[PDB]
Amino acid sequence: MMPLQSLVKALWNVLHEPDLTELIAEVESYQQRYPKQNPTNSQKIRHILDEIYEKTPFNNTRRRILWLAVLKTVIPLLILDRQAVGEWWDQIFFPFLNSPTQLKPVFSDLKSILFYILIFHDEDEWGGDLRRECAEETITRLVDLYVSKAIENLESQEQRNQTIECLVNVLVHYGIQRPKELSSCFCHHFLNPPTRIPILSVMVEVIRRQGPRLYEIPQTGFYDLVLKCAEFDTSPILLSYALSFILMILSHICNSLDDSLYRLFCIYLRFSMIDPTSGFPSSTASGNWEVFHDFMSTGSSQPDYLESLDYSQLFSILYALYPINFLEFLRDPKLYASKHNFQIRYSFNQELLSTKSDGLLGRHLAHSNFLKYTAETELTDKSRWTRLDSIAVVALCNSLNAV
Amino acid sequence: MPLQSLVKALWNVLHDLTELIAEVESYQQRYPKQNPTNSQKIRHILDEIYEKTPFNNTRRRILWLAVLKTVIPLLILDRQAVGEWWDQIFFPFLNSPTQLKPVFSDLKSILFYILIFHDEDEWGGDLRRECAEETITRLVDLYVSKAIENLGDSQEQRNQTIECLVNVLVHYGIQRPKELSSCFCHHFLNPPTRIPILSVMVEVIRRQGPRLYEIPQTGFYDLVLKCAEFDTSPILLSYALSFILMILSHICNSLDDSLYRLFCIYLRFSMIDPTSGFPSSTASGNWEVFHDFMSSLDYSQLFSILYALYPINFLEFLRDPKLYASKHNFQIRYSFNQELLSTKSDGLLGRHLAHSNFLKYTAETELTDKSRWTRLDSIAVVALCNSLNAV
């Protein structure tokens, strides 16, 4: 007998006065009746919520606490659409993120709400494509806000920080579960120079965690843009993140490798030739790309574990997988290039290249490809990549041995 | 006159080849590829020479093989011609072979000239393949027949024949494991062919050359598995297990479809008893069980392989095998002592780290989830990079 009416009753009560015991009980009670989300009750509850917003809004901490506490608990009753999540953005999320309450449990509550929308199993759950569309809208707004906040000039440095801190947290949590989706939002903005550092720092943090689905990222064209970054930009800090990112995502590909091989050769070249005085070899290129130099009138803070992710590991993976061509390429890059239809866009000192490269080469066992393939058949001949799945199994079993 | 120069030389030698060897050089110049009429001639000559001077004693063989070795790249042969050579040369040698290594060396030189080739079309039509396949078949047939047949009055003569055959078969296998596996298939169905065949087959696998992932297409793998679950003989079962352990790494795909069979074989091999030996099974079907008296790479390795890769099911299957068997539909052939399975498996389990699969999959998603097997690419790349670090 009237469970919508009891809910609205309880709802009304708790917003005019933080004890939610009555309300939680009604939600539980109510769900036993509408165990799937009801489109007219959603509509109704939202009008109640909007009504009360006019009366007592989000303008002080005690109210924000109350609001987040309540929204977090009703939102499983509602169906939302792209217009709706816009309303919550403007009424709740933007005002919090733009000037966040410095109490962790309040932010925790924000994150419950955000993440209820962002993360879900059934796409059919609110009818049609509503579920997916609200996630797409929310994340696009978070990303857009993050990117812009990371770049605008300034109203107290401390407060701007408080906002990025929240956004980075949220975006890393979202990234480790939805790496494709996040990379995809990031593509858009990444073509804009000053965004590259704030974006990459989030994307390397996502990928650090070595969570699942990392192999989806290249479909989105984000891996391509990181290579571009690595091929053309100039800022040590950015190229530093650039390399880190590609080093972590590489073992997850083997497939997008046979199309970026030459590009990785060139990247290896450039990073190995870094100069104390002239930094990274400048390119003669861009094309459409638009370079990011450091001091560019004429974010940041690289994490401590990224130093150990240098060009020496790039060598190891290239040598392990494409030794013949790799060493053929080193030793004469410009010659290798002309015969494989690409260009070297860096002035470099060949002796130095050959000394440094020797140095690393000497830490490696001799590669048995030289007994089996030619430089040309190393490239063709996909039979090679079977060996690989035998070596997997054996390493798997050894990983599982105790002693 | 080009060809006659050659033929004089062949007449000459058969009664120190330098002249012959040199005439073959000039011949090859005028006829870069093999010539069908010239070939026919030369073999027709050889056959006459055979009449009056054959393969019947040990100075003649050193000689014959030496010659046939050097001339044979000129020739073109067919299923019926290798029959001629089988009949005059190969069979009589292998049958009572000359105890001199360089003599047997020349033999192999010739055999492998036929068996291995870098060009299907070389002799026109589909001739090269025909020959290879004919020779390999006859080599197989004699190994099989010579291995089983009971011997009358001659046992050191026997060992010498198989010593050669084995040596030829293994060399062949390591280059052409698909092909050798095929030939062995029909013989394998016959109970006593199984040991001699496997002992050759493990020795091919052992060498971990290419391309062993072709073998299961031939059904040899399936036959060895049938062997593993039904046969009684320690020795043969011991080879069976050795074969599968060394073949398994190279599969990762036939695994999804032999899993329940592998579980059953792990059960059987671990339940081996000092007195009743392997669990005597009960089904066979049409298999025809090899027994013994008709008248160091063991089960812990298999445990490791199944625990990595299919931990949840493997362990759900131990603890209650018969139960696992219904619900997945196969059955358990053996009686066994459950508390002893539970004890033996606990010993091995305890040598292993705990498995991340229990945090990510159900028994059913562990079986039906293609995403899982993509982790593999990643780990392999890393192991590889580490194999190539030098300290």
Check if the beta carbon of residue B63 is closer than 8 Å to that of residue B14: yes
Q: Helix (H, G, I), strand (E, B), or coil: what is residue A283? A: coil
First to last CA, chain A: 66
CA distances from A248 to A67, A315, B307, B376 (A): 41, 14, 28, 16
Resolution limit in angstroms?
Answer: 2.9
Write the DSSP symbol of residue A37.
P
- Crossing angle of helices A21-33 and A61-74, in 10° steps, is 20
Query: Residue B144 burial (CB < 10 Å; 0-12/13-18/19+)?
Result: buried
User: Is the Cα dihedral B113, B116, B119, B123 positive or negative?
Assistant: positive
List CB contacts (< 8 A) between A360 and chain B: none
Which of A250, A389, A402 shows the shortest C-beta gap to B380?
A389
Give the count of Cβ contacts less than 8 A between chain A and B: 95
CB contact under 8 A, A320 and B388: yes
CB contact under 8 A, B381 and A321: yes
What ranges do the domains of chain B cover? Answer: 2-391
Pairwise CA distance, residues B85 & B91, whole Å: 8
Q: Amino acid identity of A213?
A: R
CA distances from B313 to A147, B310, B368 (A): 47, 6, 12
Check if the beta carbon of residue A233 is closer than 8 Å to that of residue A293: yes
List CB contacts (< 8 A) between A386 and chain B: 213, 250
Q: Helix (H, G, I), strand (E, B), or coil: what is residue A56? A: coil
Rounded to the nearest 10°, the torsion over CA A143, A149, A152, A157 is: -170
Q: Helix (H, G, I), strand (E, B), or coil: what is residue B277? A: strand
Q: Helix (H, G, I), strand (E, B), or coil: what is residue A279? A: strand
Which of A212, A391, A402 shows the shortest C-beta gap to B384?
A391
Q: What's the token pair of residue B62?
A: 């050193």
Nearest CA in chain A to B303: A397
Check if the beta carbon of residue B100 is closer than 8 Å to that of residue B60: no
Pairwise CA distance, residues B60 & B54, whole Å: 7
CB contact under 8 A, A392 and B383: yes
- Method for this entry: X-ray
Q: What's the token pair of residue B275?
A: 């007195």
Q: What's the token pair of residue B374?
A: 């993509």
Pairwise CA distance, residues B177 & B165, whole Å: 16
Q: What's the token pair of residue B182?
A: 């095929």
List CB contacts (< 8 A) between A395 and chain B: 379-380, 382-383
User: Is the Cα dihedral A272, A277, A279, A281 positive or negative?
Assistant: negative
Q: Amino acid identity of A90?
A: D
The Cβ of residue A180 has, within 10 Å, a number of other Cβ atoms equal to 16
CA distances from B255 to B146, B247, B262, B325, B340 (A): 35, 11, 9, 17, 27
Which of B249, B352, B374 shows the shortest C-beta gap to A393?
B249
Q: Helix (H, G, I), strand (E, B), or coil: what is residue A256? A: coil
Pairwise CA distance, residues A180 & A185, whole Å: 9
Q: Residue A171: CB partners within 8 Å, gap ≥ 6?
A: A142, A143, A146, A182, A202
Check if the beta carbon of residue B194 is closer than 8 Å to that of residue B235: no
Which of B355, B376, B385 shows the shortest C-beta gap to A389?
B376
Longest dimension (CA), chain B: 86
In the block, residue with structure tokens 């033929």: B7
Longest dimension (CA), chain A: 87
Looking at the complex, does the CB of residue B297 fall below 8 Å from at least one CB of chain A? Answer: no
Check if the beta carbon of residue B372 is closer than 8 Å to that of residue B361: yes
Q: Residue B130: CB partners within 8 Å, gap ≥ 6?
A: B78, B79
Check if the beta carbon of residue A298 is closer than 8 Å to that of residue B371: no
Q: Residue B19: CB partners within 8 Å, gap ≥ 6?
A: B9, B12, B13
Pairwise CA distance, residues A112 & B50, whole Å: 95
CB contact under 8 A, A396 and B211: no
Q: What's the token pair of residue A27?
A: 């939600």
CA distances from B334 to B204, B271, B278, B284, B303 (A): 32, 9, 9, 12, 19
Check if the beta carbon of residue A245 is closer than 8 Å to that of residue A309: no
Q: Residue B290: CB partners within 8 Å, gap ≥ 6?
A: B191, B192, B194, B227, B231, B232, B233, B236
Looking at the complex, does the CB of residue A377 fall below 8 Å from at least one CB of chain B? Answer: no
